[PDB]
Amino acid sequence: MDIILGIRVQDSVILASSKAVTRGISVLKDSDDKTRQLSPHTLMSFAGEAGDTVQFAEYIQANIQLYSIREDYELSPQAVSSFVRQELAKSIRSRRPYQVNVLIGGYDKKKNKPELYQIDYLGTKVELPYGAHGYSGFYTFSLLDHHYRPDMTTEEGLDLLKLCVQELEKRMPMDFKGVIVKIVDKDGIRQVDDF
Amino acid sequence: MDIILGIRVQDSVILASSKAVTRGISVLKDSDDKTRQLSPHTLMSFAGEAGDTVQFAEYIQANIQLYSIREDYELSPQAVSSFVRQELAKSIRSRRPYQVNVLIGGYDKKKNKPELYQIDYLGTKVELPYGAHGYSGFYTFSLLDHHYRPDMTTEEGLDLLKLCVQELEKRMPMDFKGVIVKIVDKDGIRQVDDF
Amino acid sequence: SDPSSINGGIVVAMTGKDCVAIACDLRLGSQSLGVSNKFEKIFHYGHVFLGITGLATDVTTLNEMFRYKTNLYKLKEERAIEPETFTQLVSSSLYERRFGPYFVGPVVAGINSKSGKPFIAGFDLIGCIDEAKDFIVSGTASDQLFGMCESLYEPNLEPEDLFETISQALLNAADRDALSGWGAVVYIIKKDEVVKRYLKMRQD
Amino acid sequence: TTIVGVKFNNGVVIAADTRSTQGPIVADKNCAKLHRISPKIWCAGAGTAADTEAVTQLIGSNIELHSLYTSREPRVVSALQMLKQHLFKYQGHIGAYLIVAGVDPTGSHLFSIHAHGSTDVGYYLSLGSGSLAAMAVLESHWKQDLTKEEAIKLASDAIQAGIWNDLGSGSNVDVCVMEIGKDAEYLRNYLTPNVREEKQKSYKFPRGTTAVLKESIVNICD
Amino acid sequence: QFNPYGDNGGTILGIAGEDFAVLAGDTRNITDYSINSRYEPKVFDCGDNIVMSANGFAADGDALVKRFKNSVKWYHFDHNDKKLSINSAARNIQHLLYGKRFFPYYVHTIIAGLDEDGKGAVYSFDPVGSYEREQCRAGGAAASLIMPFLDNQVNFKNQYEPGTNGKVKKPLKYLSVEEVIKLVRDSFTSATERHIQVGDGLEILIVTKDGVRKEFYELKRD
Amino acid sequence: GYDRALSIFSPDGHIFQVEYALEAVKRGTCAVGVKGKNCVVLGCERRSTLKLQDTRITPSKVSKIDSHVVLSFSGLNADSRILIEKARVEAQSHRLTLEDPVTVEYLTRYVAGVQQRYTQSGGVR
Amino acid sequence: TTTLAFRFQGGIIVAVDSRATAGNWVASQTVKKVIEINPFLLGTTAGGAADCQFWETWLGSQCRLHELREKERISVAAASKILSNLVYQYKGAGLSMGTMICGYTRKEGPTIYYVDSDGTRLKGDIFCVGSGQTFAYGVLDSNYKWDLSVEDALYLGKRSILAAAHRDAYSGGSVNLYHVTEDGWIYHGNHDVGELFWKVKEEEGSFNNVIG
Amino acid sequence: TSIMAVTFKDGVILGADSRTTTGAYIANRVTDKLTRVHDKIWCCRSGSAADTQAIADIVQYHLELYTSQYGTPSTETAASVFKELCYENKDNLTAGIIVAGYDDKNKGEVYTIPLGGSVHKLPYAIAGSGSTFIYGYCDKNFRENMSKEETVDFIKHSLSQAIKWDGSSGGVIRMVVLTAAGVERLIFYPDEYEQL
Amino acid sequence: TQQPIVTGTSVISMKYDNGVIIAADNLGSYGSLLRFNGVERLIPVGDNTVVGISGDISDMQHIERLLKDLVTENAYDNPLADAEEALEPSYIFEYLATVMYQRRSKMNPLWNAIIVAGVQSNGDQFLRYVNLLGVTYSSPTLATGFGAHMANPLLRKVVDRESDIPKTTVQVAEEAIVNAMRVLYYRDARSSRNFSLAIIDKNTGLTFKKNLQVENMKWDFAKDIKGYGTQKI
Ligand SMILES: *[C@@](C)(CO)[C@](*)(O)[C@H](CC(C)C)NC(=O)[C@H](Cc1ccccc1)NC(=O)[C@H](CC(C)C)NC(=O)[C@H](CCc1ccccc1)NC(=O)CN1CCOCC1
Ligand SMILES: *[C@@](C)(CO)[C@](*)(O)[C@H](CC(C)C)NC(=O)[C@H](Cc1ccccc1)NC(=O)[C@H](CC(C)C)NC(=O)[C@H](CCc1ccccc1)NC(=O)CN1CCOCC1
Ligand SMILES: *[C@@](C)(CO)[C@](*)(O)[C@H](CC(C)C)NC(=O)[C@H](Cc1ccccc1)NC(=O)[C@H](CC(C)C)NC(=O)[C@H](CCc1ccccc1)NC(=O)CN1CCOCC1
Ligand SMILES: [Cl-]
Ligand SMILES: [Mg+2]
Ligand SMILES: [Mg+2]
Ligand SMILES: [Mg+2]
Ligand SMILES: [Mg+2]
Numbered sequence A, B: 001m002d003i004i005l006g007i008r009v010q011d012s013v014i015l016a017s018s019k020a021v022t023r024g025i026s027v028l029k030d031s032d033d034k035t036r037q038l039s040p041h042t043l044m045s046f047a048g049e050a051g052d053t054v055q056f057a058e059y060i061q062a063n064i065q066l067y068s069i070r071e072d073y074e075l076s077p078q079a080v081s082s083f084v085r086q087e088l089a090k091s092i093r094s095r096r097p098y099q100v101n102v103l104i105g106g107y108d109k110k111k112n113k114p115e116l117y118q119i120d121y122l123g124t125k126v127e128l129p130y131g132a133h134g135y136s137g138f139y140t141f142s143l144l145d146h147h148y149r150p151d152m153t154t155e156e157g158l159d160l161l162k163l164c165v166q167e168l169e170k171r172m173p174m175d176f177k178g179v180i181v182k183i184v185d186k187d188g189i190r191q192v193d194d195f
Numbered sequence C: 001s002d003p004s005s006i007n008g009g010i011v012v013a014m015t016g017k018d019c020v021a022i023a024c025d026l027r028l029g030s031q032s033l034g035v036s037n038k039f040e041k042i043f044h045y046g047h048v049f050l051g052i053t054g055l056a057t058d059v060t061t062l063n064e065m066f067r068y069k070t071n072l073y074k075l076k077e078e079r080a081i082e083p084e085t086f087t088q089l090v091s092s093s094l095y096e097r098r099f100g101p102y103f104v105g106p107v108v109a110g111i112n113s114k115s116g117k118p119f120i121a122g123f124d125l126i127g128c129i130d131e132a133k134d135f136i137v138s139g140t141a142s143d144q145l146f147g148m149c150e151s152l153y154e155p156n157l158e159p160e161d162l163f164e165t166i167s168q169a170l171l172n173a174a175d176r177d178a179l180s181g182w183g184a185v186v187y188i189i190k191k192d193e194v195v196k197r198y199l200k201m202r203q204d
Numbered sequence D: 001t002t003i004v005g006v007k008f009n010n011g012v013v014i015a016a017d018t019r020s021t022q023g024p025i026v027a028d029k030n031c032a033k034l035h036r037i038s039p040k041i042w043c044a045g046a047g048t049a050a051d052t053e054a055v056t057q058l059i060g061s062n063i064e065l066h067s068l069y070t071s072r073e074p075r076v077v078s079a080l081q082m083l084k085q086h087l088f089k090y091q092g093h094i095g096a097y098l099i100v101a102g103v104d105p106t107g108s109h110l111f112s113i114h115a116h117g118s119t120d121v122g123y124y125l126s127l128g129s130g131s132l133a134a135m136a137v138l139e140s141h142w143k144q145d146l147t148k149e150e151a152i153k154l155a156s157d158a159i160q161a162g163i164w165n166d167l168g169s170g171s172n173v174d175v176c177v178m179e180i181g182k183d184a185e186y187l188r189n190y191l192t193p194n195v196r197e198e199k200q201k202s203y204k205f206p207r208g209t210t211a212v213l214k215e216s217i218v219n220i221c222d
Numbered sequence E: 001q002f003n004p005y006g007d008n009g010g011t012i013l014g015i016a017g018e019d020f021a022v023l024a025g026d027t028r029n030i031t032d033y034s035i036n037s038r039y040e041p042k043v044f045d046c047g048d049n050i051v052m053s054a055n056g057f058a059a060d061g062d063a064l065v066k067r068f069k070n071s072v073k074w075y076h077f078d079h080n081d082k083k084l085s086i087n088s089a090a091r092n093i094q095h096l097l098y099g100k101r102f103f104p105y106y107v108h109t110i111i112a113g114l115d116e117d118g119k120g121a122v123y124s125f126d127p128v129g130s131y132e133r134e135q136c137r138a139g140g141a142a143a144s145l146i147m148p149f150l151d152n153q154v155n156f157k158n159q160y161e162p163g164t165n166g167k168v169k170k171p172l173k174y175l176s177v178e179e180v181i182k183l184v185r186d187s188f189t190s191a192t193e194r195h196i197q198v199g200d201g202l203e204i205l206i207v208t209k210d211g212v213r214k215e216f217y218e219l220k221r222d
Numbered sequence F: 001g002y003d004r005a006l007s008i009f010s011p012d013g014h015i016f017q018v019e020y021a022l023e024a025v026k027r028g029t030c031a032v033g034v035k036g037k038n039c040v041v042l043g044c045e046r047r048s049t050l051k052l053q054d055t056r057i058t059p060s061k062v063s064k065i066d067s068h069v070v071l072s073f074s075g076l077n078a079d080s081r082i083l084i085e086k087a088r089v090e091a092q093s094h095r096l097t098l099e100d101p102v103t104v105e106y107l108t109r110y111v112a113g114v115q116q117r118y119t120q121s122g123g124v125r
Numbered sequence G: 001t002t003t004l005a006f007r008f009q010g011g012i013i014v015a016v017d018s019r020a021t022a023g024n025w026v027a028s029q030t031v032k033k034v035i036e037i038n039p040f041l042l043g044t045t046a047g048g049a050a051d052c053q054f055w056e057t058w059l060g061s062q063c064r065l066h067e068l069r070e071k072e073r074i075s076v077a078a079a080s081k082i083l084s085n086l087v088y089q090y091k092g093a094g095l096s097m098g099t100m101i102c103g104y105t106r107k108e109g110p111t112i113y114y115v116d117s118d119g120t121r122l123k124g125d126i127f128c129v130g131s132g133q134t135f136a137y138g139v140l141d142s143n144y145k146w147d148l149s150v151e152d153a154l155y156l157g158k159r160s161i162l163a164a165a166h167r168d169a170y171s172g173g174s175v176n177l178y179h180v181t182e183d184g185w186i187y188h189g190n191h192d193v194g195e196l197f198w199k200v201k202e203e204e205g206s207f208n209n210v211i212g
Numbered sequence H: 001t002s003i004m005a006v007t008f009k010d011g012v013i014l015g016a017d018s019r020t021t022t023g024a025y026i027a028n029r030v031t032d033k034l035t036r037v038h039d040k041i042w043c044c045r046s047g048s049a050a051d052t053q054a055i056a057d058i059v060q061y062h063l064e065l066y067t068s069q070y071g072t073p074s075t076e077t078a079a080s081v082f083k084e085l086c087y088e089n090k091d092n093l094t095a096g097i098i099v100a101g102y103d104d105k106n107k108g109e110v111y112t113i114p115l116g117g118s119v120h121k122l123p124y125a126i127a128g129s130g131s132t133f134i135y136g137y138c139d140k141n142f143r144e145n146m147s148k149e150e151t152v153d154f155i156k157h158s159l160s161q162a163i164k165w166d167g168s169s170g171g172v173i174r175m176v177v178l179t180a181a182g183v184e185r186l187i188f189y190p191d192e193y194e195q196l
Numbered sequence I: 001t002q003q004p005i006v007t008g009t010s011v012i013s014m015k016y017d018n019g020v021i022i023a024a025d026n027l028g029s030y031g032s033l034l035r036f037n038g039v040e041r042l043i044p045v046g047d048n049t050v051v052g053i054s055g056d057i058s059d060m061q062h063i064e065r066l067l068k069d070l071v072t073e074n075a076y077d078n079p080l081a082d083a084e085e086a087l088e089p090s091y092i093f094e095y096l097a098t099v100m101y102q103r104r105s106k107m108n109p110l111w112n113a114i115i116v117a118g119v120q121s122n123g124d125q126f127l128r129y130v131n132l133l134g135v136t137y138s139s140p141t142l143a144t145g146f147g148a149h150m151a152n153p154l155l156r157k158v159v160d161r162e163s164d165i166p167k168t169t170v171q172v173a174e175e176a177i178v179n180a181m182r183v184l185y186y187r188d189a190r191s192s193r194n195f196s197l198a199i200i201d202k203n204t205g206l207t208f209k210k211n212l213q214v215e216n217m218k219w220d221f222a223k224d225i226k227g228y229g230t231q232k233i
Helices: A052-071 A077-091 A135-147 A154-171 B052-071 B078-089 B136-148 B154-171 C056-077 C084-096 C142-152 C158-172 D050-068 D076-089 D131-141 D148-165 E058-078 E086-098 E143-153 E175-193 F014-025 F077-098 F104-117 G049-070 G076-089 G131-141 G150-168 G193-204 H047-069 H076-087 H131-142 H148-165 I057-076 I089-105 I144-157 I172-186 I220-224
Strands: A004-008 A011-016 A020-022 A025-027 A035-041 A042-047 A101-110 A113-119 A126-128 A130-134 A178-186 A187-194 B004-008 B013-019 B021-023 B028-029 B034-037 B041-050 B100-108 B114-120 B124-129 B130-133 B181-184 B188-192 C010-016 C019-026 C029-031 C033-035 C041-047 C049-056 C104-111 C118-123 C128-130 C135-139 C186-188 C194-200 D003-008 D011-017 D020-022 D025-026 D034-038 D041-047 D094-104 D107-113 D119-121 D124-127 D174-180 D187-192 D212-218 E011-016 E023-028 E030-031 E034-037 E044-045 E051-056 E107-114 E120-125 E132-133 E136-140 E201-208 E211-218 F031-035 F040-044 G004-008 G011-014 G020-022 G025-028 G035-040 G041-044 G099-107 G109-116 G121-123 G126-129 G174-181 G186-191 H004-009 H013-014 H020-022 H024-030 H034-038 H042-048 H094-103 H108-113 H118-124 H125-127 H173-179 H183-188 I004-007 I010-014 I020-025 I028-030 I033-036 I042-044 I049-056 I113-121 I125-131 I136-138 I141-143 I195-203 I205-213
Touching: A004 A101, A004 A135, A004 A154, A011 A101, A011 A113, A011 A154, A020 I172, A025 B154, A025 E044, A025 G131, A035 A052, A035 B130, A042 A052, A042 A077, A042 A178, A042 I042, A052 A101, A052 C033, A052 D107, A052 D187, A052 H094, A077 A101, A077 A113, A101 A130, A113 A130, A126 E143, A135 A154, A154 B028, A178 D050, A178 F014, A187 B188, A187 D131, B004 B041, B004 B136, B004 B154, B004 F014, B013 B041, B013 B100, B013 B114, B013 B154, B021 C118, B028 H004, B041 B052, B041 B078, B052 B078, B052 B100, B052 D050, B078 B100, B078 B124, B078 C056, B100 B130, B100 F077, B114 B130, B114 I033, B130 B136, B136 B154, B136 C033, B136 G131, B136 G150, B154 B181, B154 G131, B154 I220, C010 C104, C010 C118, C010 C142, C010 C158, C019 C041, C019 C049, C019 C118, C019 C158, C033 G150, C041 C056, C049 C056, C049 C084, C049 C135, C056 C084, C056 C104, C084 C104, C084 C118, C084 C128, C104 C135, C104 C186, C118 C135, C142 C158, C142 D025, C142 E175, C158 C186, C186 D107, D003 D041, D003 D107, D003 D148, D011 D034, D011 D041, D011 D094, D011 I141, D025 E051, D034 D187, D034 E023, D041 D050, D041 D076, D041 D174, D050 D076, D050 D094, D076 D094, D076 D107, D076 H047, D094 D124, D107 D124, D107 G121, D107 I028, D119 E030, D119 H131, D124 D131, D131 D148, D131 E051, D131 I144, D131 I172, D148 D174, D148 D187, D148 E086, D148 I144, D148 I205, D174 E044, D174 I020, E011 E051, E011 E107, E011 E120, E011 E175, E023 E044, E023 E107, E023 E120, E023 I144, E034 F031, E034 H076, E034 I136, E044 E201, E044 G109, E051 E136, E051 H076, E051 H131, E058 E086, E058 E107, E058 I089, E058 I136, E086 E107, E086 E120, E086 E132, E107 E136, E107 E201, E120 E136, E120 H076, E132 I195, E136 E143, E143 H034, E175 E211, E175 H108, F014 I220, F040 F077, F040 I057, F077 F104, F077 G076, F077 H034, G004 G099, G004 G109, G004 G131, G004 G150, G011 G099, G011 G109, G011 G150, G011 H076, G035 G049, G041 G049, G041 G076, G049 I057, G076 G109, G099 G126, G099 G174, G099 H125, G109 G126, G126 G131, G126 I028, G150 G174, G150 H034, G174 I028, H004 H042, H004 H094, H004 H108, H004 H131, H004 H148, H013 H034, H013 H042, H013 H094, H013 H125, H020 H173, H024 H042, H024 I172, H034 H173, H042 H047, H042 H076, H047 H076, H047 H094, H047 I010, H076 H094, H076 H108, H094 H125, H094 H173, H108 H125, H118 H125, H125 H131, H148 H173, H148 I033, H183 I220, I004 I033, I004 I057, I010 I113, I010 I125, I010 I144, I010 I172, I020 I042, I020 I049, I020 I113, I033 I195, I042 I057, I042 I205, I049 I057, I049 I089, I049 I195, I057 I113, I089 I113, I089 I125, I113 I195, I125 I141, I141 I144, I144 I172
Parallel strands: none
Antiparallel strands: A004 A011, A004 A130, A011 A178, A020 A025, A035 A042, A042 A101, A101 A113, A113 A126, A178 A187, B004 B013, B004 B130, B013 B181, B021 B028, B034 B041, B041 B100, B100 B114, B114 B124, B181 B188, C010 C019, C010 C135, C019 C186, C029 C033, C041 C049, C049 C104, C104 C118, C118 C128, C186 C194, C194 D212, D003 D011, D003 D124, D011 D174, D020 D025, D034 D041, D041 D094, D094 D107, D107 D119, D174 D187, E011 E023, E011 E136, E023 E201, E030 E034, E044 E051, E051 E107, E107 E120, E120 E132, E201 E211, F031 F040, G004 G011, G004 G126, G011 G174, G020 G025, G035 G041, G041 G099, G099 G109, G109 G121, G174 G186, H004 H013, H004 H125, H013 H173, H020 H024, H034 H042, H042 H094, H094 H108, H108 H118, H173 H183, I004 I028, I004 I049, I010 I020, I010 I141, I020 I195, I028 I033, I042 I049, I049 I113, I113 I125, I125 I136, I195 I205
């Protein structure tokens, strides 16, 4: 767990998440998918403490899927993000808090708009055009401040994302073994296999 | 400073040293040469505390060059390594010790033999067929135990070295930005530009 | 960060009938990482033998120091230093660094050339002399060596029998210590001949 | 360690056990804790082994030079003064706990010194880990006007209490008797009540049991 | 601050033969440098031909033995007086120890007896319940002294056949009860010499198909 | 807590509360299940004494427990919601721990187990 | 400890050492670090000895209860997740476990899961776990190919443990080999490093750092 | 320790117990805490045995060198030398010293020197761990210009109580009498003073 | 987690041919302050057992109440309470040992060292130790605190092993105990001159001696000791 990025463009949300799982002085895995599909049009990436990350992600996934079955209806990205925030807001004052930071990328079918939410382990939620967790932000935010435009296409967003990964691969101390990129839009969630 | 390797083969000593210089969450440089030529047939690579490494390397370099001028004669790799060890052995009981680990690769012209010495910051000297400092050893030693042979050529040594760098690039957590490789033999010191 | 157990290693010395034996392992490591399997811990100045365990830099430094001091001794005295005299020199030199000591466990072994008496001794890091008729032990597997020697040893062993006893003491002690082993050397010392034997032991 | 000192009619006697420890391990089963400062001034030492040996030799060396300078036999109070001032200067870091005794032109004397440099005077004293076991015996059996043979018995009994009851002490009993008008007699291994019993089996190996890789003759000659 | 643990010293030793097994232990009980008892047994017959010892912190050791003895009693009540096999006892003891994983019994436990084929069996446990069947095990204060000697003499480690160029190992064979007791006695006399917490007395419990026999031997009391 | 044993045996060896619960099922609207060669079909009756109904929002008789399993019922409508909710929760819990959706047999076994528990628990019918 | 397991053309190789330590004290050279959960499931053990052994024997009981209840052998995923969910409940309490759940089922095929005491659960083709994991990785990675034969794969697994047993001070004793196929696991013997090292050195010509 | 010094008609008397401790163990039950720095200038020692001995030895040296050059020193002069050592080395010393002496001009004088190294001239002084238990008693019972026998009884009764309550005090009660007549040593054993 | 406030020092004891002897001084120390002087630290249970307690006095008084209550509870529905079903020393000890270990296991110990001395119904001598840690042991001589260091050595010269017990009379045994109490008064800074001594004999029964004093002390040699080295006056 280290690098998770998110970029909201005109018609989609793009999440990029590093593939490395490192422990001590050993990269145990270089093909890890740090994300779970909460619903057909909502995707959550995650990063933080070992064990906590997946345990939390799957717990949220289970709850959202339970809701979908019960009501035969998909929750909006705003609704899901609020549910997630509250779970983390409870967690931070527990005996042992979930040390997990997440990005929630979704496409609201009622509004026909992409939405990106950034939530930290404290339960701090913000809606953003682009987001990042951990040390990634210290490079990508300034870069996106410069190159990002609100009316960009998905293809323009992927090029913008390539520019971030290149910068991180140049200046980051650790080898994060590239990223898995996923796109969330009106047609649902799909993975870019060649990045 | 992180990765420094050394391999003694039939007719030469090969030193490989990482190019990255990091400080914090930023790779400040990716083309750093972590070595100094002590004499025409003696090369010292180094790694450790920032500042201490270069300061120590150049101090040793100055002393050996002074000796060469005074006597119009090149010290043997064994003699240089003993001089270096003593300097570190003094240092460790100083007010502020040099936190520097070194490898000394040299070609003894009188014996017509390559020699590789590994010395840590405590002043712990050992002559070896292959050596490493820091976390590198935890991967390369076992690898070399398997693939190394004493009668190998310089070209076979470089392939053996490529095998080490590949393993380190696969399993090491940090991005060390490749290595500068140098060969020490009867004709002196030369750098491999394409590695 | 315990200087005496960073590099690892062991030394053991025994007396026999008109002979002494001193033996050591060959490991030098950095905590868990084994680095060198050729690091000998026994040196000699004339007919006097010195084994040193502990921090490897100090082992090397002290060898160079006692070579220095025994060479000057011989030039001025016009004779080789004896084990009893060398033992005192080691003790003096170590206690000189009382409040900044060398982190070592030295072991003297040899035969007095005048009297012919077998002699062994041990020291702590600040130079306290531990003289013994039977055996001296040192290193990270000192507990193991004490147990092996105290049970296996018997007085007045012949050089060929003494070799087997000291070798088995070292080997089985080293195999119960993580930081010791990786090969071993045994010196058998008679009045005017010395035999050095490398032992075959498990390499883990 | 257990060490003691006992004054008698015409002099003083000191004694000590012979165990040297290294943590819970017995390093030396028969070490000598009785030290000669001068011919008729002897010292029993407890605490840090190197320190007791070093401090007693240093003061013993200076006492010899002093004795030659002054053309006089050395006095116990001189050794006492030189030891305490040395130990005090090092603020207890030199861990030497000593029982100083001897005879000189002034008479017979018995003192103790602690690592921090405090001295005490007495007819019977005990220092070391087994001092409480020893002092219990001394307090139970000591009396004024002891003879030579009575003092040796009392002293060795006090050491034995330490040997048996204190884990820090063991093996043998050393004794040194310093009588006025006579040479001091050092009784090394005066008692040996802890002899190792015969082993059940001989562990002499058949020749060739140990696997060997290499042999070579070592050159010790020039 | 209150420290709920203590070190009562002592050492134990288990060896397994072909049709027998021994579990030995010294009888000395200590705290710091003081002897509490020269004869305090810590090797117990627990029934069903199982002998047990839990060396280390005596209070935890007694508690454990007490609980296992009780476990054997209830095993009979709940399972029609069935004999508790040594392997079943071992697994039961693991759960006793691991039950206090977060406030452990500070002891090295060893049990001995016969397996279901009638062959000698020794099991050893760490403080939190890790266990392993072995031919040989020493435990406690002097375990580090005794264990390598056992490797050499019981399992013939580092011993090769003479004249075979270190190529053929000394062949493994079962030892007789006479030869095993020799090794136990020599192990404990050696440990007594070099370890301060070991001495006073040696108590051996021998387990055969006939039952549980006892043997006692004096050890040095210094 | 209310402890009363409501479901108990009678002299003839019958648990009347369980048998009277079957009468409630017999009162309920008809439901039918027929499985073919490559499909299953669940048919359900809806009584026509209720006109002016809003069929968009009225609870459907067939309920999805997961994306691959469905549950229809006959009897008390309010009771059925409790079983359906429990079954849906267990369906998600199974996916979470076993990393695989429930089998139809497993889901049935769970629901049946819940029904059984209410036949020998105090304070419940 | 050094333990590994890798996936390849002919199934799964699993190899472990047998050393147990208490600090620098070598406590045992004959520990069984592969736990046979059933004829199709294996588990490896690195870290706290009691923790691994206790909870993996417990895991076997939970897997037995599964097949009694469900009339079907448990999946490797479900088995590994029972263990990971268990240790996650104890997170922070100080459990020390580095394990690998290896096995074959029809639906999954050959599968390896890394599970550790801080709750990490990872599916993968190659893993090395323990104090000497890096030494094993060095040899394993540099010689690994998917198209290895059963004979060559068994040797590589053995040779990798030997490499770590040699260099890592806290690894050694002997090598235990296992091969997992569609028909279940197969034991391939206990190999003492004492004889195996010299045998490998001579035949392979490797270990030139050591005095021959 | 329990120590005190008391001036009276003919001069001054020093008093002390004889216990030396290491924790709760009594290392010496017959200690002499009353020590001579000059013919008729003595001191009571409390605190560290090593420190107070080292100090007293230096003071004795200084006053011997003083006497060789300038003749007999005053009691005030002796107290000043003690102060100088205790004050300048306050960080490294644990010494509570009472200085008492007899001049022919000044008669009996008592100076007390606590931990800090301050000097306090008093009619009588008490110090040591056991002194705490007799502040009440000594204040109520002390009178100026007492006789020798009265002062001896005052010290004996006082130190008897200090010993009775203080675990760090015990053994015999030593006393040193300083008058124009000379120097007299007195000792009193448990069997006498305990049943006072 | 506790710290002891008012404390009692050594309790010493030994076996002899027909029974056991146990002793303890009557002091209740408050740190270095010798606060309370009328404290009885030997508590008889029935006519066949004496429990000697050192350490925290508040916890000692709690243990007194427990033993007192144990006698009451044993008498309930027990016609043989003063005969076959009377309280044995072994019963009393095991009860205390259970409590001590349960309290240490709850990290709230009774800050004491206890010696249970008595004679069983079959005539056998009983002498066993237990402390705040729940550690138990038995020996021919037992002592707590400074007694372990100074008394045991002296008492072991009389009874060094099991075979020396029949050879030791009550006169010799009491003489050694009284001597040990004197040595402790010389050398233990938290001890008093006044003490209690109890003898439990299989023939003569329980003899409880109060208000004993240490006597025949050697102090005369003190007058000769002057200075700390060089002083002659
Ligand atoms: C009784 C036995 C103890 O009460 C006696 O007092 C004797 C006195 C006689 C021998 C003069 N004391 C000892 O035997 C003494 C006990 C001791 C131990 C540690 C500190 C103080 C006192 N033992 C020693 O002094 C041994 C002598 C050896 C066996 C020859 N020395 C050590 O144990 C040294 C201690 C050195 C030291 C350094 C700095 C301050 C104080 C002491 N310790 C080691 O050698 C341990 N270690 C081994 C691995 O290498 C690093 C050092
Ligand atoms: C390699 C060999 C490196 O550890 C492997 O990882 C093996 C795995 C195998 C054994 C399954 N691990 C160990 O050997 C492991 C290392 C370790 C030690 C301590 C904590 C975590 C990991 N060793 C153990 O678990 C040993 C096994 C014994 C020797 C059979 N056990 C101990 O060290 C025990 C119990 C440790 C413990 C855990 C949790 C709470 C309390 C204790 N400790 C002792 O026995 C302590 N000590 C031994 C020396 O004698 C005095 C008492
Ligand atoms: C009464 C007792 C208290 O006021 C008197 O003042 C006497 C004065 C007389 C003797 C001149 N004081 C003592 O007896 C004095 C009490 C004391 C203790 C510690 C610090 C200051 C005062 N006792 C000593 O000085 C002894 C004398 C030795 C045993 C002969 N020395 C120690 O107890 C040494 C002192 C070391 C020290 C520490 C801090 C400052 C200065 C010196 N301490 C030890 O030996 C430690 N010991 C180790 C074993 O565990 C118990 C403590
Ligand atoms: Cl004093
Ligand atoms: Mg080893
Ligand atoms: Mg190894
Ligand atoms: Mg012993
Ligand atoms: Mg008192």
